[PDB]
Design a protein around this motif. Structure first.
Motif, PDB file in Angstrom:
ATOM      1  N   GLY A  37       1.011  -1.245  -0.263  1.00 12.30           N
ATOM      2  CA  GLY A  37       0.086  -0.048  -0.095  1.00 12.30           C
ATOM      3  C   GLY A  37       0.796   1.264  -0.056  1.00 12.30           C
ATOM      4  O   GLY A  37       1.611   1.382   0.813  1.00 12.30           O
ATOM      5  N   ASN A  75       0.287   5.622  -1.485  1.00 11.52           N
ATOM      6  CA  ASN A  75      -0.163   6.692  -2.518  1.00 11.52           C
ATOM      7  C   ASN A  75       0.819   6.944  -3.264  1.00 11.52           C
ATOM      8  O   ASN A  75       1.934   6.088  -3.556  1.00 11.52           O
ATOM      9  CB  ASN A  75      -0.694   7.963  -1.605  1.00 11.52           C
ATOM     10  CG  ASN A  75      -1.865   8.617  -2.367  1.00 11.52           C
ATOM     11  OD1 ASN A  75      -2.166   8.372  -3.293  1.00 11.52           O
ATOM     12  ND2 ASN A  75      -2.052   9.833  -1.656  1.00 11.52           N
ATOM     13  N   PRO A 114       1.483   6.768  -6.661  1.00  6.38           N
ATOM     14  CA  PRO A 114       2.198   5.559  -7.536  1.00  6.38           C
ATOM     15  C   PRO A 114       2.801   6.008  -8.649  1.00  6.38           C
ATOM     16  O   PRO A 114       2.655   7.121  -9.332  1.00  6.38           O
ATOM     17  CB  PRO A 114       0.902   4.959  -8.074  1.00  6.38           C
ATOM     18  CG  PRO A 114      -0.361   5.566  -7.278  1.00  6.38           C
ATOM     19  CD  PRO A 114       0.215   6.771  -6.955  1.00  6.38           C
ATOM     20  N   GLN A 170      -3.409  -5.707  -4.462  1.00  2.00           N
ATOM     21  CA  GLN A 170      -2.710  -4.621  -3.631  1.00  2.00           C
ATOM     22  C   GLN A 170      -1.688  -4.294  -4.357  1.00  2.00           C
ATOM     23  O   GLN A 170      -1.165  -3.182  -4.470  1.00  2.00           O
ATOM     24  CB  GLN A 170      -2.936  -5.165  -2.392  1.00  2.00           C
ATOM     25  CG  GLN A 170      -3.768  -4.713  -1.110  1.00  2.00           C
ATOM     26  CD  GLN A 170      -4.620  -3.443  -1.624  1.00  2.00           C
ATOM     27  OE1 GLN A 170      -5.781  -3.544  -1.607  1.00  2.00           O
ATOM     28  NE2 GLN A 170      -3.927  -2.474  -1.423  1.00  2.00           N
ATOM     29  N   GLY A 226      -2.345  -3.016  -7.912  1.00  4.16           N
ATOM     30  CA  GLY A 226      -3.516  -2.203  -8.010  1.00  4.16           C
ATOM     31  C   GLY A 226      -3.219  -0.583  -7.913  1.00  4.16           C
ATOM     32  O   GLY A 226      -4.111   0.088  -7.810  1.00  4.16           O
ATOM     33  N   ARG A 227      -1.904  -0.264  -7.674  1.00  2.00           N
ATOM     34  CA  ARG A 227      -1.482   1.341  -7.490  1.00  2.00           C
ATOM     35  C   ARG A 227      -0.550   1.520  -8.547  1.00  2.00           C
ATOM     36  O   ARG A 227       0.602   1.485  -8.370  1.00  2.00           O
ATOM     37  CB  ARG A 227      -0.945   1.571  -6.125  1.00  2.00           C
ATOM     38  CG  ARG A 227      -2.158   1.774  -5.115  1.00  2.00           C
ATOM     39  CD  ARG A 227      -2.742   0.457  -4.751  1.00  2.00           C
ATOM     40  NE  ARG A 227      -3.927   0.620  -3.736  1.00  2.00           N
ATOM     41  CZ  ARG A 227      -3.706   0.456  -2.281  1.00  2.00           C
ATOM     42  NH1 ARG A 227      -2.437   0.538  -1.792  1.00  2.00           N
ATOM     43  NH2 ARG A 227      -4.688   0.811  -1.572  1.00  2.00           N
ATOM     44  N   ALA A 228      -0.882   1.916  -9.976  1.00  2.00           N
ATOM     45  CA  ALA A 228      -0.046   2.241 -10.732  1.00  2.00           C
ATOM     46  C   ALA A 228      -0.408   3.525 -11.524  1.00  2.00           C
ATOM     47  O   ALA A 228       0.193   4.312 -12.390  1.00  2.00           O
ATOM     48  CB  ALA A 228      -0.125   1.201 -11.910  1.00  2.00           C
TER      49      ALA A 228
END
Length: 54
Positions: free
Chosen positions: A17, A19, A21, A48, A51-53
């Motif tokens: 996790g 922010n 990204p 997870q 999922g942050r790109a």
RNA sequence: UUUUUUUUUUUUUUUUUUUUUUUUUUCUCCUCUUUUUUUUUUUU
């Protein structure tokens, strides 16, 4: 945060996790080492990590 | 081919006071022998 560094190498202390990204994420292996069963990843982890790109 | 997380040295300070050395016992108690008492006087 300011983009002055390009390539980052990180373990799960930064993976699952965040922010802010970056654009791309890469995986160098399929498995992981949990608490002495040496399992593989599961969708709850891959969502997870990947999922942050954007 | 072995990741992730598990805090640390109690808080407080801006209260008044008009006395005076000591301190408190010990009982009545047979004095042995020449005397009246000598005596002025002068040299310091």
């Amino acid at each position: 945060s300011r983009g002055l560094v390009k390539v980052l190498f990180a373990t799960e202390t930064f993976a699952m996790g965040v922010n802010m990204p970056a654009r791309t994420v890469v995986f160098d292996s399929m498995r992981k080492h949990d608490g002495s069963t040496f399992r593989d990843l599961l969708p709850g982890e891959y969502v997870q990590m990947a999922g942050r790109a954007g």
